[PDB]
């Protein structure tokens, strides 16, 4: 996925990564919904649900934590 | 996020919404609309999205909505922002909850240089759940039986290093002369050189003597600010047992919980409460960061209090004088229309809640008597510092000087004369039948100017 | 551990085809691991109820509170009542992830009047409040047997029922008064029959 | 030449949103017009004066004055009118129902110019509903305390009222509770009387509750009647019922009063007990259609004062107007915003401002064959009280309880699955009375009633 550590739009406050959505697409199944490769040893085998998103094709975003912007008690450190 | 969902510029606010007006200055690069939406989101659920709120379709019932971001003229890189909060976010009877919910963590936002809270509007639905002033204005003017003129008070300046015996003698001298109230210094509670029970005893003795001797009703503000709540209640109960009619408190160092507790006690036990405003310049002195004082005056009128310090306006330039007149009108009156020229941002209706009495102080003398008498009117108290204890003859002569000057000015205002132009003339034709007023007019040479 | 004297329990409950040969611990470990979607393992809790497993015990083992259990069972029942009749797959493929809290409100309507309600509620993205008020307005329609302009709103579709609710609520007033205008404009924004529309325009405008 | 406007009947006057509105239905004696009758009703409920003689002495006696702003005739009846009156917000004490009552209905009902007077509705502003406490818990909180989701609650009242020992009373309570019911109810007339004192009844009932709840695996409750001659005695009973660990108590708000009911509601709020409000001595007021106080007003005053459950009486059907009125004032105490609907009985648009709801309780002479209709009228936020429908089963109390439980579960399941309950009810019950003999006997005892409601 993107490699912005924690970045906004050029002038706006909207976080660039999620574009203000607050949610991104799963990076394991690529929005597919089912697992593709066996991952650990065989307890997560291909054909079943995705091991990460549990079958929702949509996860939260790290830089902007569910807040459509950068700053505040969710995305930044409290002083 | 081209849609902001928090900046609804066409939203009109209800009559059960709490409105707030901020003046903010955004960082370089950030626009104004998004800064307003961010101020609305920080002081509520701190999200623009709906990834948590959409738990079971329980959305947007507990979020604020910016609806006006007009800019302020003169200054640039500085704007006004209006915000509307629902009513079911706040609890009843608690001012701490309102403060915590609004100004809790918005001031620590990172994408703004500075942020100030200028006004606030409480709906009637929320005004009716607080007690308010214990007594008010009409009741506290009927209890003391003093009609048709301001009240007179004196502060005792030789604060520290005075035995309780001498303290009582000075109080007796001042009160016997003709004053109404004496005031206890702000930082005299229980120091080792003068404990509080002794002070209370001798002050009560002096009050009883002077009141039984002069026929009027006298009083002394007794400072009950304590380290805990048990000590505060002990001091208040003892001051009531002696028969004292009025006490004192500090609502900004002791807090709002202690002030609400004391106000409820004072309502139940028939005592008047005078509120001193120490430690207030720490919050509101700079015009670019803090909490304007009219917001704290409103919060005080809500929680409790009968008198309130407000500061003189005899030498302010303009705007500041208009601002102080505005937030004096916000305290004494019952319905105030929006007039941005004198501070008031929103229309406030108090639903027949009693008023609060302004107090002027800070080194004023007899020559200021006309101006004050026509600015604050007759619903106020006038505190004198050196203007009473500095008379060449003593304390009782200074008391009589101030009393004579005040009654002369008010009698001259009643007849229809003008106090701006010919106030000094009135004082001069009054300072002929009395030596004390003549000595006072000769000591304070300040006849500065009028009109 | 059987809990004494529960004689009101039904005989049993049906289980989907894929789980017809599992034990109780299999149901437990498939509920706890979410190894299905809600409409697959709702019959599993509905069946576990009939073996002496009280909702507190299932909440202790699996980890879903009783309110969520009841919501899921009722939602799966409503969905199964929808799919087995005249329908179109725009919604069954949309009720796959998170549609129970909305299916819990159309449970008051009989199977005849559920597909139309589902279409109306998913076409405009309405939450639980609007769904509850819509179902209540639909159920209040046959009671008003005779009123001002009742037969001009058809009842085989939810838009006209809700529009009639708004329209009869607006008539509790007089000359526009700036409050009737809002209610009438909100009524014309949900109606979907041309006869109701031309009546609403006949009364709000021109006449 | 003409009376100067009467100063009280101001037709073109819309009332502000901080005024208390009241709707009277009055009928005046022959030879009196309606206009001044309405103006006199407005002057009696306040300063009893049309003139301005008792004022103008530096006083504004026009801020404490009602104003009849609307008079209309009742369609379908001659010589009877509706008068609307608006009072300010300054006449009323903050947080007192006694004061509202004694300020509105104090003197006016004895006015000699009218032949009859009835108070049909009343509207409180938000500024006034915010100064009261309301129900101690509400609906959601009391559904979470008992942990009963997705069905009406079941309760039984004990018919062999008197002459029964406390130990025997406890045994019957136990038998009913372990059969499958949720709540049992103390008889209203039962206080500490020579044959059964209160502390003994409390002891044995608490013991039965603990036994049955521990052996059946869910939460059971009994409403203990804590009505006393004095407030101090009432507090002793309530405190001892809390010490035993009881979840719910009972009061009686029309013979004890509103002061005692407000005090008990505050105690219950501070100590986490639910409160059930019995409805006794009410037909003395709200029975005759032309005098008294409609029960809708008292339901509103109760939601203000305090109480979680309220009796409403089964309304399975007598006539569509009366059942419409009952549905009106049943939705006036569960919802949060009720729009004016003159057919249902509501006159004003009432807004409650996030005050909790109140559960309506259906009671009195209902049995198994009535279960479908009820389940679709009151819904799922309600209680169903059974009298002889539980203790009269051919072979005991526990099988009667089980029959009622089975019938209720079957009906709500068949409603969730999609079927209707106005045409498939009897068939639902006969299908459920095959794998269960108790329900079969109960169906054989009571005769099936044929509903003929709006089927078209």
UniProtKB/Swiss-Prot annotation, chain A:
It comes from the Eukaryota. GO terms for biological process: chaperone-mediated protein folding; ribulose bisphosphate carboxylase complex assembly. Keywords: Chaperone, Chloroplast, Metal-binding, Plastid, Repeat, Transit peptide, Zinc, Zinc-finger. Signal peptide: none annotated. GO terms for cellular component: chloroplast; chloroplast stroma; cytosol; protein folding chaperone complex. GO terms for molecular function: protein folding chaperone; zinc ion binding. It is found in: Plastid, Chloroplast stroma. Interacts with the RuBisCo large subunit (RbcL) assembled as an intermediate complex made of eight RbcL and eight BSD2 subunits. This is Protein BUNDLE SHEATH DEFECTIVE 2, chloroplastic. The gene is BSD2. The chain holds residues 58 to 136 of 136 of the full protein.
From Swiss-Prot, chain B:
It holds the Pfam family RuBisCO_large_N. Its EC number is 4.1.1.39. Changing residue 111 to Y: Reduced formation of the RbcL8-(RbcX2)8 complex. Keywords: Bacterial microcompartment, Calvin cycle, Carbon dioxide fixation, Carboxysome, Disulfide bond, Lyase, Magnesium, Metal-binding, Monooxygenase, Oxidoreductase, Photorespiration, Photosynthesis. GO terms for biological process: photorespiration; reductive pentose-phosphate cycle. It comes from the Bacteria. Substrate binds at residues 105, 155, 159, 277, 309, 361. Mg(2+) binds at residues 183, 185-186. The active site is at residues 157, 276. PROSITE patterns: RUBISCO_LARGE. It is found in: Carboxysome. The keyword Cytoplasm does not apply. SUPFAM superfamilies: RuBisCo, C-terminal domain, RuBisCO, large subunit, small (N-terminal) domain. The record marks 316 as: Transition state stabilizer. GO terms for molecular function: magnesium ion binding; monooxygenase activity; ribulose-bisphosphate carboxylase activity. The disulfide bond which can form in the large chain dimeric partners within the hexadecamer appears to be associated with oxidative stress and protein turnover. CDD domains: RuBisCO_large_I. Binds 1 Mg(2+) ion per subunit. RuBisCO catalyzes two reactions: the carboxylation of D-ribulose 1,5-bisphosphate, the primary event in carbon dioxide fixation, as well as the oxidative fragmentation of the pentose substrate in the photorespiration process. Both reactions occur simultaneously and in competition at the same active site. Belongs to the RuBisCO large chain family. Type I subfamily. Heterohexadecamer of 8 large chains and 8 small chains; disulfide-linked. The disulfide link is formed within the large subunit homodimers. The exposed C-terminus binds in a cleft in the RbcX2 (shown with endogenous and Anabaena strain CA protein). RbcX2 is displaced by RbcS; as RbcX2 is removed RbcS mediates the ordering of an internal RbcL loop (Thr-64-Leu-70) in a catalytically active conformation. This is Ribulose bisphosphate carboxylase large chain. The gene is cbbL.
Curated annotation (Swiss-Prot), chain C:
Residues 15-204 are annotated as: N-terminal alpha-helix. It is found in: Plastid, Chloroplast. Transmembrane segments: none annotated. Homodimer. Required for assembly or stability of RuBisCO. Acts at a postchaperonin step to fold and/or assemble the large subunit (rbcL) into RuBisCO. RAF1 brackets an rbcL dimer (rbcL(2)), leading to rbcL(8)-RAF1(4) complex formation. In the next step, RBCS displaces RAF1, thus resulting in holoenzyme formation. Has 3 domains, the N-terminal alpha-helical domain, an extended flexible linker and the C-terminal beta-sheet domain. The N-terminal alpha-helical domain stabilizes RbcL dimers and RbcL dimer-dimer interactions, facilitating RbcL(8) formation. The C-terminal beta-sheet domain probably dimerizes Raf1. The 2 C-terminal beta-sheet domains are swapped and pack against each other to form the dimer interface. Belongs to the RAF family. This is Rubisco accumulation factor 1.2, chloroplastic.
């Amino acid at each position: 996925a993107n490699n912005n550590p924690q970045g906004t739009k050029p002038n706006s406050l909207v976080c660039a990564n999620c574009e203000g959505e607050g949610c991104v697409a799963c990076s394991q199944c690529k929005g597919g919904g089912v697992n593709l490769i066996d991952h650990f040893n065989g307890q997560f085998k291909a054909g079943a649900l995705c091991w990460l998103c549990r079958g929702k094709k949509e996860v939260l975003c790290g830089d902007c934590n569910g807040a459509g912007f950068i700053g505040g008690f969710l995305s930044t450190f409290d002083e | 996020d081209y849609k902001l969902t928090y900046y609804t510029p066409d939203y009109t606010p209800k009559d059960t919404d709490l409105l707030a007006a901020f003046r903010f200055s955004p960082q370089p690069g950030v626009p104004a609309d998004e800064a307003g939406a961010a101020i609305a989101a920080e002081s509520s659920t701190g999200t623009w999205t709906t990834v948590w709120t959409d738990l079971l379709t329980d959305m947007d019932r507990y979020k604020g909505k910016c609806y006006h971001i007009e800019p302020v003229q003169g200054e640039e890189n500085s704007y006004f922002a209006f915000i509307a909060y629902p009513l079911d976010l706040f609890e009843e009877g608690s001012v701490t909850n309102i403060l915590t919910s609004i100004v809790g963590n918005v001031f620590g936002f990172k994408a703004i240089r500075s942020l100030r809270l200028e006004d606030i509007r409480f709906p009637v639905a929320l005004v009716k759940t607080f007690q308010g002033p214990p007594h008010g204005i009409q009741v506290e003017r009927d209890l003391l039986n003093k009609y048709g003129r301001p009240m007179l008070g004196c502060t005792i300046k030789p604060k520290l290093g005075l035995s309780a015996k001498n303290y009582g003698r000075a109080v007796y001298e001042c009160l016997r002369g003709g004053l109404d109230f004496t005031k206890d210094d702000e930082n005299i509670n229980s120091q080792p050189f003068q404990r509080w029970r002794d002070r209370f005893l001798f002050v009560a003795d002096a009050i009883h003597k002077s009141q039984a001797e002069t026929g009027e009703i006298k009083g002394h503000y007794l400072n009950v600010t304590a380290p805990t709540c048990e000590e505060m209640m002990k001091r208040a109960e003892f001051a009531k047992e002696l028969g004292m009619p009025i006490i004192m408190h500090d609502f900004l160092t002791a807090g709002f919980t202690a002030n609400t507790t004391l106000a409820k006690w004072c309502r139940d036990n028939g005592v008047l409460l005078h509120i001193h405003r120490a430690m207030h310049a720490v919050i509101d002195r700079q015009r670019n960061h803090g909490i304007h004082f009219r917001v704290l005056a409103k919060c005080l009128r809500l929680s409790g209090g009968d008198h309130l310090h407000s500061g003189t306006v005899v030498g302010k330039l303009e705007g500041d004088k208009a601002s102080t007149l505005g937030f004096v009108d916000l305290m004494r009156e019952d319905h105030i229309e929006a007039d941005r020229s004198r501070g008031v941002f929103f229309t406030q209706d108090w639903a027949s809640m009693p008023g609060v009495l302004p107090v002027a102080s800070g080194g004023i003398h007899v020559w200021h008597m006309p101006a004050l008498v026509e600015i604050f009117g007759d619903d106020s108290v006038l505190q004198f510092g050196g203007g009473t204890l500095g008379h060449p003859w003593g304390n009782a002569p200074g008391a009589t000087a101030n009393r004579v000057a005040l009654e002369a000015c008010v009698q001259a205002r009643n007849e229809g004369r003008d106090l701006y132009r010919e106030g000094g003339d009135i004082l001069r034709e009054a300072g002929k039948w009395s030596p004390e007023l003549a000595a006072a007019l000769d000591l304070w040479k300040e006849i500065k100017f009028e009109f | 551990m059987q809990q004494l004297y529960q004689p009101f329990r039904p005989p049993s409950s049906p289980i989907p085809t894929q789980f017809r040969s599992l034990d109780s611990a299999g149901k437990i470990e498939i509920l706890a691991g979410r190894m299905a979607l809600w409409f697959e393992y709702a019959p599993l809790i509905s069946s576990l109820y009939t073996d002496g497993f009280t909702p507190p015990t299932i909440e202790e083992l699996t980890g879903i509170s009783s309110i969520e259990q009841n919501r899921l069972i009722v939602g799966a029942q409503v969905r199964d009542s929808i799919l087995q009749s005249i329908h179109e797959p725009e919604l069954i493929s949309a009720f796959d992830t998170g549609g129970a809290e909305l299916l819990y409100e159309i449970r008051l309507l009989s199977t005849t009047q559920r597909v139309a309600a589902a279409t109306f509620i998913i076409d405009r993205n309405i939450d639980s409040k609007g769904a509850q008020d819509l179902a209540r307005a639909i159920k209040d329609y046959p009671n008003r047997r005779g009123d001002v302009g009742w037969l001009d709103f058809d009842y085989n579709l939810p838009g006209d029922c809700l529009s009639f609710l708004y329209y009869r609520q607006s008539r509790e007033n007089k000359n526009p008064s700036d409050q009737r205008t809002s209610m009438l404009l909100q009524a014309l924004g949900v109606a979907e029959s041309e006869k109701a529309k031309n009546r609403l325009n006949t009364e709000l405008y021109g006449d």
